[PDB]
């Protein structure tokens, strides 16, 4: 309904989310239109003034990317771009992309696999920079990670 | 429900066009175009002289969001944060019946999370409280 | 149903709950019969033997008193009388006042405004003395705050 | 459900007329007029010799309440706190099937809260446990 | 449905669970077939490698044994055998005993009485040894308590 | 759902006949006779080089259980713990689509509790992850 979809390009692995939202990768969960992304079912992030950024935290289900993301994590591989695309039901009753969150030069700092979409997986990124854009109303803003 | 307006020293009306179709999609409801909807609030004063805590508000992702996240990373002094609270009147009509206004508030924390929500904390220099229908009010400097 | 209603008289402000449970003050929540009180939707208090009293803690919704109570709190104003009246459904099927809790020379020590009756507000009083009376059965007892 | 009786050294039967119309309004149920209804219980013994914990009971606001709050602020030694537990018998009838009796119990904490409830803690000198239908029993000094 | 039943034999008291699951002892809860046991409605236990055993923890309702178990606890009485019998719905639709847990030379280390089967009671045993047996498939294993 | 196989150095296939009528009664489902059903999983890797956490799995009481509790009290090195994850395929059929395999895993904690459940923790020397339908994989030494 109002899910996010994500893409990862790793310096070593290329597009990590390639063919990752497909019948093969997700099975009965598959919906067309986002075949080279991953279906984000979670999100948490926080910037505070004691600025200090906190790691970005997404949640997905087990998939084609998953074994790759671990490789990423355990390898210490810099992620050239992680880009989170936000979706909503528009005012005219159609699904639309209306917000973007984007990491530049991100690094995966931890992963947790757990069963509760019953097969789950949270992934955490730090990054050198993050950009928030509103896609319909045209507002945008970005910033450099601190601490 | 509540609607909030934020005017900052750099950006002006940060909440301009923030409750429109473009901003919040299907959730749009005419009448509060230059206000962000607030559906969560937290604030506290505790007692020897009183000390203040930050006002926390929860909103959804909208046009204001990136501006807000800017207001926080910049350190921009919010001239006015104004929260108008609505309720169903005794006669059966939505009415604006309360305001909580912060002067020179600052954003000291923002938490985004997932439907797609975002918490905002402000400290400030002065808070005002007014009951619009019964005509009572009070205010206090931050400490 | 089984709500409490309260009255506050402040040394400086007089009857703080005056006209505070009315259409103007509470809106659609209004029920006649308690116009000069406030509708208490919460209560917590505790006396212990390590006697030591703990602050009295009520909960209400935003109202006509609310901006006043803050004035009280931030002013350090001594409350001459806070009096909490307890209501229940009687044995004959009618609502009745059957219990009273009363503070003498109370002081408001903290307030919390929060949205969950969706607009809420907890208020805490210390006091020099508190009296508990059962109104139908005639039992009563009082005591001086300690610590 | 459970019903409790408390006789104190100063007041006598603190729970006299405590489960009547006057005391608990609509919730009244004949048969236990000189007992307060208990709908919450907590107690523990843990093990080198055993130590005791206070018996906690939860009741509603009633005629006993102010007397109880007195018993605590006075320090009055409760000669007897007696808790009789009821259940539905195998034949389909409410029956008294268990007792927990404290001797020289003391009230060491009371928590009132809101439908309108109140927790009571007792320490004591001796607790007895008896199963009324199966005819088993035990008891122990506080330590 | 899938309850456990237990037996206790104490060095001093003999069979502590004798006549303890009966009309007299449990009232309307009574089901025939386990008259000399107790109806276990809880269970918790854990063995870890920092081996170190943790106390065995069962839950029952108030009953004929209960005043006895306290005697046991407060007396420091060694329990010659506590034996927990596990029940399930078989593949052919009939209730069966399929697992056993058994303590040798156990000691009751604490009891908690509490009201939530509304009248409840958790009991904790340490022990010199515990044996786990699967009754249909024939697997078994035992061990000595450590720490 | 998931099914797990465990081969140990002393016992061989610890999960042999562990998902049969004899083992799990009414819950039996043909096709995975030498696998224990896993209906709960927890595992984590966190980041300067990576460190591993134990894989936790939850199962019911079954034929494997006492063997498992032995594997823990003995200290027996598990040659292979293999977890195959199933899902409903896009075409509407249960399919094995993922594996998590531990090499030389050790049981470092077991928690039994009540319908009748049991948690197992393994540390290990090497974990592998493979996506069976999309053909991706990774693995890592414990640290």
Swiss-Prot record, chains B, D, F:
Its main location: secreted. It comes from the Bacteria. Keywords: Secreted. InterPro entries: Hcp1-lik_sf (IPR036624), T6SS_Hcp (IPR008514), T6SS_Hcp1_domain (IPR052947). It is found in: Secreted. GO terms for cellular component: extracellular region. Disulfide bonds: none annotated. Belongs to the hcp1 family. NCBIfam families: VI_effect_Hcp1. This is Major exported protein. The lineage of its organism: Bacteria, Pseudomonadati, Pseudomonadota, Gammaproteobacteria, Pseudomonadales.
